[PDB]
Amino acid sequence: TLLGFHTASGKKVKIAKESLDKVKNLFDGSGFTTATEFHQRRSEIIQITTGSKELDKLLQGGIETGSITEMFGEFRTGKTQICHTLAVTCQLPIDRGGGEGKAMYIDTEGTFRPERLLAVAERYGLSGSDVLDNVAYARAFNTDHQTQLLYQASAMMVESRYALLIVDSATALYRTDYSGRGELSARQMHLARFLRMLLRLADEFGVAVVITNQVVAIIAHASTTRLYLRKGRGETRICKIYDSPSLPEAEAMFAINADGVGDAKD
Amino acid sequence: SEIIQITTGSKELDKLLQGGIETGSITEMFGEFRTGKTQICHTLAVTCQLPIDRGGGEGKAMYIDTEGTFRPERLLAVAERYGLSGSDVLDNVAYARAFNTDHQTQLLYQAEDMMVESRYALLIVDSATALYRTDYSGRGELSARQMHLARFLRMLLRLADEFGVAVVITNQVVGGNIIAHASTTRLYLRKGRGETRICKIYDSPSLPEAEAMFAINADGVGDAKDTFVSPAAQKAFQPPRSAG
Numbered sequence A: 001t002l003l004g005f006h007t008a009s010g011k012k013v014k015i016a017k018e019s020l021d022k023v024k025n026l027f028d029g030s031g032f033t034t035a036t037e038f039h040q041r042r043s044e045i046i047q048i049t050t051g052s053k054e055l056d057k058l059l060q061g062g063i064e065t066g067s068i069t070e071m072f073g074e075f076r077t078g079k080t081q082i083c084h085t086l087a088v089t090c091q092l093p094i095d096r097g098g099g100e101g102k103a104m105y106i107d108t109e110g111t112f113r114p115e116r117l118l119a120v121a122e123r124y125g126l127s128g129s130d131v132l133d134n135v136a137y138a139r140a141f142n143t144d145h146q147t148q149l150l151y152q153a154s155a156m157m158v159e160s161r162y163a164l165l166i167v168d169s170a171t172a173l174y175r176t177d178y179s180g181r182g183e184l185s186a187r188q189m190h191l192a193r194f195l196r197m198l199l200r201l202a203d204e205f206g207v208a209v210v211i212t213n214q215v216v217a218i219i220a221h222a223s224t225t226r227l228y229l230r231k232g233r234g235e236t237r238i239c240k241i242y243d244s245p246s247l248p249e250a251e252a253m254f255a256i257n258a259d260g261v262g263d264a265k266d
Numbered sequence B: 001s002e003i004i005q006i007t008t009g010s011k012e013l014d015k016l017l018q019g020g021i022e023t024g025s026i027t028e029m030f031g032e033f034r035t036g037k038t039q040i041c042h043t044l045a046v047t048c049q050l051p052i053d054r055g056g057g058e059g060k061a062m063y064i065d066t067e068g069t070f071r072p073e074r075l076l077a078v079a080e081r082y083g084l085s086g087s088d089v090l091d092n093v094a095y096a097r098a099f100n101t102d103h104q105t106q107l108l109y110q111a112e113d114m115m116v117e118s119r120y121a122l123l124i125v126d127s128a129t130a131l132y133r134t135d136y137s138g139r140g141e142l143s144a145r146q147m148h149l150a151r152f153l154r155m156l157l158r159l160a161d162e163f164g165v166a167v168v169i170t171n172q173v174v175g176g177n178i179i180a181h182a183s184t185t186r187l188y189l190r191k192g193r194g195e196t197r198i199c200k201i202y203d204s205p206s207l208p209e210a211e212a213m214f215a216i217n218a219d220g221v222g223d224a225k226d227t228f229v230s231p232a233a234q235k236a237f238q239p240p241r242s243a244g
């Protein structure tokens, strides 16, 4: 039993046994409506801002809740920085572009820094002590611990209201392919079950699931929105819509300032 | 009733099918990812509301989605493309999301009564196999799930034969395939070079096995120019207005 889900401040998060028994039936009555009712229901989907105007205009609002957003790219392209920015912007009010919910950060590469959270909170004018208490951080060392963290996340999401679930490099613990053959099936199964559990959580709790994928120079669901991060010339970073059920392939520009994601300061 | 054929939005695809999607039978569209299955379904869900002279079916559309990829924005886009009022187009489409095989099967029971009440012309089952391809670890359940899919296809055939609706099911491609037996028309969608999307008549009792090219523009399919309740879905088929 490793360290479970702690907060960015360091204190341990305690879970009631009723919540554990309430989510064990998970991972195992809707009717016909007119397309107008469903289009209205999609207009009610809370979308979390990213701090960048051009990025929010590219996504027509921001990170959509209820689905999986997969940000992939090369090293030092802004995935972890965008995750740190979202982990604080999700606590903003709905009128300010937030989700009014706590954040959840599953780190697999040891690149979690509460200092960036404090910086972006000072940017948006929030209490630095409150934003660190509304972010449940958990470090994962292997795939089994990752899935156990997902189980603990399902247990936690019922007591308190969460709006964002971050999986920083979900493939970091899976891309340890030092073995020859054989593991390419078991690891694929584990990753597929992990993605399906993420989809189940996103559908059940309406939480925006944002996952990070390292690309050197997977089985994405049809509803998954895929973003590709690339470095341009200078500080200008380019985000492209690789695949989206509702958005066509387009590009936008953004930058990473000391306070997080923003527009390119030319 | 006489057989109506629905315009697919692409001239080459309409001439390939000698009119378009045939009603009363099953049309199985299968292919890889990002091949145009969901986009063709979205285009058909609006083109089936056109008058018979314009290549429509003069009936409401039914969209049973299983992957969360139903966007009425595409319907509004293709309705503006065909010059139809978006309100009447979105009001004549009954949408339902299925989460498991049991729900996907039970939705057709309600669909029967819905087609009894109001006139429907198109029943879309987007990824009818996605909930059945949940092999996961049970990659050999076979007859356990083969009997459920058999009853699902039997109900699809029953509805298509009784109400004369065009049943279009989507299949994802990477004991005997009962889908190949239950489906009359079979289209294979492949990705050529670039936006070159190749649609091939893989099997048809009347249409020859030929191929055609098409693309997915911002207004739908086109040619490369070289318990379970129902609220307002119970309303009758309202013919779409012009709004232009």
Ligand SMILES: Nc1ncnc2c1ncn2[C@@H]1O[C@H](COP(=O)(O)OP(=O)(O)O)[C@@H](O)[C@H]1O
Pocket (backbone or CB within 6 Å): A074, A075, A076, A077, A078, A079, A080, A081, A082, A111, A256, A257, A258, A259
């Ligand atoms: N304290 C900081 N102030 C401003 N920019 C920073 C700071 N720390 C990192 N960055 C920027 O963020 C980028 C790091 O991206 P990161 O998200 O860590 O890559 P990855 O997606 O591989 O995790 C660097 O290019 C750097 O310019």
Ligand SMILES: Nc1ncnc2c1ncn2[C@@H]1O[C@H](COP(=O)(O)OP(=O)(O)O)[C@@H](O)[C@H]1O
Pocket (backbone or CB within 6 Å): A222, A245, A246, A247, A248, A249, B032, B033, B034, B035, B036, B037, B038, B039, B040, B216, B217, B218, B219
């Ligand atoms: N709004 C849009 N404008 C232009 N092209 C689009 C739009 N939405 C999707 N597309 C194109 O349609 C394709 C999606 O095909 P789709 O039918 O969703 O795949 P599948 O058959 O796996 O469901 C993408 O490759 C994309 O290029």
Ligand code: BEF
Pocket (backbone or CB within 6 Å): A075, A076, A079, A080, A109, A111, A168, A169, A212
């Ligand atoms: F911290 Be990362 F995603 F490289």
Ligand code: BEF
Pocket (backbone or CB within 6 Å): A222, B033, B034, B037, B038, B067, B069, B126, B127, B170
């Ligand atoms: F939208 Be899919 F992949 F049918």
